[PDB]
Design an enzyme around this catalytic site. Structure first.
Site, PDB file in Angstrom:
ATOM      1  N   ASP A  55      -5.937 -13.286 -10.987  1.00  0.00           N
ATOM      2  CA  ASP A  55      -5.252 -12.305 -11.822  1.00  0.00           C
ATOM      3  C   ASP A  55      -3.741 -12.432 -11.632  1.00  0.00           C
ATOM      4  O   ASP A  55      -3.028 -11.462 -11.377  1.00  0.00           O
ATOM      5  CB  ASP A  55      -5.776 -10.901 -11.523  1.00  0.00           C
ATOM      6  CG  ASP A  55      -5.391  -9.886 -12.575  1.00  0.00           C
ATOM      7  OD1 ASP A  55      -4.647 -10.219 -13.526  1.00  0.00           O
ATOM      8  OD2 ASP A  55      -5.837  -8.732 -12.438  1.00  0.00           O
ATOM      9  N   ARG A 108       2.752  -8.262 -13.318  1.00  0.00           N
ATOM     10  CA  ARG A 108       2.376  -6.996 -12.675  1.00  0.00           C
ATOM     11  C   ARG A 108       1.802  -7.197 -11.276  1.00  0.00           C
ATOM     12  O   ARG A 108       1.818  -6.258 -10.473  1.00  0.00           O
ATOM     13  CB  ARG A 108       1.349  -6.236 -13.521  1.00  0.00           C
ATOM     14  CG  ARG A 108       0.053  -7.005 -13.681  1.00  0.00           C
ATOM     15  CD  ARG A 108      -1.011  -6.288 -14.473  1.00  0.00           C
ATOM     16  NE  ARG A 108      -2.132  -7.221 -14.631  1.00  0.00           N
ATOM     17  CZ  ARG A 108      -2.212  -8.116 -15.604  1.00  0.00           C
ATOM     18  NH1 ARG A 108      -1.276  -8.169 -16.537  1.00  0.00           N
ATOM     19  NH2 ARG A 108      -3.225  -8.974 -15.645  1.00  0.00           N
ATOM     20  N   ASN A 109       1.294  -8.390 -10.969  1.00  0.00           N
ATOM     21  CA  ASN A 109       0.736  -8.707  -9.658  1.00  0.00           C
ATOM     22  C   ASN A 109       1.649  -9.648  -8.882  1.00  0.00           C
ATOM     23  O   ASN A 109       1.198 -10.471  -8.088  1.00  0.00           O
ATOM     24  CB  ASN A 109      -0.663  -9.290  -9.810  1.00  0.00           C
ATOM     25  CG  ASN A 109      -1.670  -8.252 -10.268  1.00  0.00           C
ATOM     26  OD1 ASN A 109      -1.587  -7.077  -9.884  1.00  0.00           O
ATOM     27  ND2 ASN A 109      -2.626  -8.673 -11.089  1.00  0.00           N
ATOM     28  N   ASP A 114      -1.936  -9.605  -4.091  1.00  0.00           N
ATOM     29  CA  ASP A 114      -3.314  -9.222  -4.415  1.00  0.00           C
ATOM     30  C   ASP A 114      -4.139 -10.406  -4.922  1.00  0.00           C
ATOM     31  O   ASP A 114      -5.088 -10.261  -5.703  1.00  0.00           O
ATOM     32  CB  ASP A 114      -3.307  -8.077  -5.414  1.00  0.00           C
ATOM     33  CG  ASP A 114      -2.701  -6.813  -4.817  1.00  0.00           C
ATOM     34  OD1 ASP A 114      -3.154  -6.402  -3.722  1.00  0.00           O
ATOM     35  OD2 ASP A 114      -1.767  -6.253  -5.412  1.00  0.00           O
TER      36      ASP A 114
HETATM   37  C1  LIG Z   1       2.708  -4.022  -1.392  1.00  0.00           C
HETATM   38  N1  LIG Z   1       3.075  -3.053  -2.420  1.00  0.00           N
HETATM   39  N2  LIG Z   1       2.097  -2.493  -3.247  1.00  0.00           N
HETATM   40  C2  LIG Z   1       2.405  -1.642  -4.196  1.00  0.00           C
HETATM   41  C3  LIG Z   1       1.313  -1.092  -5.029  1.00  0.00           C
HETATM   42  C4  LIG Z   1       1.243   0.284  -5.251  1.00  0.00           C
HETATM   43  C5  LIG Z   1       0.217   0.801  -6.018  1.00  0.00           C
HETATM   44  C6  LIG Z   1      -0.746  -0.031  -6.553  1.00  0.00           C
HETATM   45  C7  LIG Z   1      -0.713  -1.394  -6.323  1.00  0.00           C
HETATM   46  N3  LIG Z   1      -1.672  -2.289  -6.851  1.00  0.00           N
HETATM   47  C8  LIG Z   1      -2.845  -2.575  -6.232  1.00  0.00           C
HETATM   48  O1  LIG Z   1      -3.162  -2.009  -5.186  1.00  0.00           O
HETATM   49  C9  LIG Z   1      -3.771  -3.567  -6.854  1.00  0.00           C
HETATM   50  C10 LIG Z   1      -3.281  -4.491  -7.797  1.00  0.00           C
HETATM   51  C11 LIG Z   1      -4.137  -5.419  -8.377  1.00  0.00           C
HETATM   52  C12 LIG Z   1      -5.485  -5.452  -8.037  1.00  0.00           C
HETATM   53  C13 LIG Z   1      -6.395  -6.459  -8.699  1.00  0.00           C
HETATM   54  C14 LIG Z   1      -7.810  -6.325  -8.128  1.00  0.00           C
HETATM   55  C15 LIG Z   1      -5.872  -7.885  -8.499  1.00  0.00           C
HETATM   56  C16 LIG Z   1      -6.489  -6.175 -10.194  1.00  0.00           C
HETATM   57  C17 LIG Z   1      -5.985  -4.535  -7.113  1.00  0.00           C
HETATM   58  C18 LIG Z   1      -5.134  -3.608  -6.515  1.00  0.00           C
HETATM   59  C19 LIG Z   1       0.315  -1.927  -5.551  1.00  0.00           C
HETATM   60  C20 LIG Z   1       0.369  -3.424  -5.359  1.00  0.00           C
HETATM   61  O2  LIG Z   1      -0.561  -3.904  -4.402  1.00  0.00           O
HETATM   62  C21 LIG Z   1       3.751  -1.248  -4.394  1.00  0.00           C
HETATM   63  C22 LIG Z   1       4.715  -1.772  -3.569  1.00  0.00           C
HETATM   64  N4  LIG Z   1       6.073  -1.471  -3.636  1.00  0.00           N
HETATM   65  C23 LIG Z   1       6.721  -0.583  -4.471  1.00  0.00           C
HETATM   66  C24 LIG Z   1       8.056  -0.354  -4.153  1.00  0.00           C
HETATM   67  C25 LIG Z   1       8.783   0.498  -4.920  1.00  0.00           C
HETATM   68  C26 LIG Z   1       8.161   1.106  -6.023  1.00  0.00           C
HETATM   69  C27 LIG Z   1       8.946   2.034  -6.851  1.00  0.00           C
HETATM   70  O3  LIG Z   1       8.486   3.133  -7.065  1.00  0.00           O
HETATM   71  N5  LIG Z   1      10.155   1.692  -7.354  1.00  0.00           N
HETATM   72  C28 LIG Z   1      10.932   2.636  -8.172  1.00  0.00           C
HETATM   73  C29 LIG Z   1      12.353   2.683  -7.587  1.00  0.00           C
HETATM   74  O4  LIG Z   1      12.911   1.364  -7.493  1.00  0.00           O
HETATM   75  C30 LIG Z   1      12.065   0.302  -7.937  1.00  0.00           C
HETATM   76  C31 LIG Z   1      10.762   0.365  -7.135  1.00  0.00           C
HETATM   77  C32 LIG Z   1       6.809   0.844  -6.291  1.00  0.00           C
HETATM   78  N6  LIG Z   1       6.137   0.010  -5.509  1.00  0.00           N
HETATM   79  C33 LIG Z   1       4.356  -2.694  -2.563  1.00  0.00           C
HETATM   80  O5  LIG Z   1       5.223  -3.177  -1.840  1.00  0.00           O
END
Ligand SMILES: Cn1nc(-c2cccc(NC(=O)c3ccc(C(C)(C)C)cc3)c2CO)cc(Nc2ccc(C(=O)N3CCOCC3)cn2)c1=O
Length: 264
Positions: free
Chosen positions: A127, A131-132, A145
């Site tokens: 995938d 977005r990933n 992921d």
């Molecule tokens: C490792 N990780 N994971 C996430 C994060 C958070 C929520 C959900 C997710 N996704 C998942 O868990 C996920 C993704 C894909 C899958 C399949 C099975 C391949 C389809 C399964 C699970 C993830 C990614 O794994 C967000 C991160 N970091 C951030 C950092 C900042 C922000 C944020 O809010 N902002 C706004 C302010 O400035 C920009 C960043 C969001 N996420 C991060 O470092």
């Protein structure tokens, strides 16, 4: 490897993904981590826990590292490297007007390097998409992921006619036969290059998923984004050969991207 849940400090919500809630926190007070709390019923846990060592051993600068897991309690935790700028698709769109073409090419190189590594380990992402991919505080892009799609329990994601299936990143042999291979990651990488060079546009926008499947099966492809040079487009386009065995490897793609860098 099994992480001691006592070593984790939950600090902030990070939203929700395919496995439910994810939190930002720290490991032993010092290392920033993301912690997935696996929604019960969202994951084939036996299959994942059974095959998880290999995934922890995937180690590369351009992969979002899997630090380990907590499985002695429910919900199980997956603990990964934290990336301060979040996912690449939102990063592209929010910083759309700042990027220089050389930075776009550097992002592609980041991902290609990670994928060359996975390829060499015979490990499929399944995938790959903007977005990933995640972006750290210095603008380095990393692939996230990888391989977890194999453990999703959600018919809308696992069925190629489901609303969540990554149709727009899938080659014909995946949409028709579910033949995943290194060459289906290759196809997805080309689409990801298109995401990067279009500054976060949606591929085949205003097409439905089925219309996308139909129109790629008939040989139609994504247009060259304005910011992509001819050479750059040739690279992303070679990922979209109808016949999988005509698509390059990630080693060749990396060479192509380096060649473009040398020339500039
Ligand atoms: C490792 N990780 N994971 C996430 C994060 C958070 C929520 C959900 C997710 N996704 C998942 O868990 C996920 C993704 C894909 C899958 C399949 C099975 C391949 C389809 C399964 C699970 C993830 C990614 O794994 C967000 C991160 N970091 C951030 C950092 C900042 C922000 C944020 O809010 N902002 C706004 C302010 O400035 C920009 C960043 C969001 N996420 C991060 O470092």
């Amino acid at each position: 490897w099994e992480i001691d849940p006592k070593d984790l400090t939950f600090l902030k919500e990070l939203g929700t993904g395919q496995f439910g809630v994810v939190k930002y926190g720290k490991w032993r007070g010092q290392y920033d981590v993301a912690i997935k709390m696996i929604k019960e019923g969202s994951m084939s846990e036996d299959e994942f826990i059974e095959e998880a060592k290999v995934m922890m051993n995937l180690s590369h600068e351009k992969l979002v590292q899997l630090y380990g897991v907590c499985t002695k309690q429910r919900p199980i935790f997956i603990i990964t490297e934290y990336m301060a700028n979040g996912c690449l698709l939102n990063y592209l769109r929010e910083m759309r007007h700042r990027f220089q073409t050389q930075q776009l090419l550097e992002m592609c190189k980041d991902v290609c390097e990670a994928m060359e590594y996975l390829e060499s380990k015979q490990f499929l992402h399944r995938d790959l998409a903007a977005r990933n991919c995640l972006v750290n505080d210095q603008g380095v892009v990393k692939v996230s992921d990888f391989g977890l799609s194999r453990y999703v329990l959600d018919d809308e994601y696992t069925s190629s006619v489901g609303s969540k299936f990554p149709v727009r990143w899938s080659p014909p042999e995946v949409l028709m036969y579910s033949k995943f291979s290194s060459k289906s990651d290759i196809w997805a990488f080309g689409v990801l290059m298109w995401e990067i060079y279009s500054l976060g546009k949606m591929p085949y926008e205003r097409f439905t998923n089925s219309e996308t499947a139909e129109h790629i099966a008939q040989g139609l492809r994504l247009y060259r984004p304005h910011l992509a040079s001819e050479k750059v487009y040739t690279i992303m386009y070679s990922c979209w050969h109808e016949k999988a065995d005509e698509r390059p490897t990630f080693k060749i793609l990396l060479s192509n991207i380096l060649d473009v860098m040398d020339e500039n």
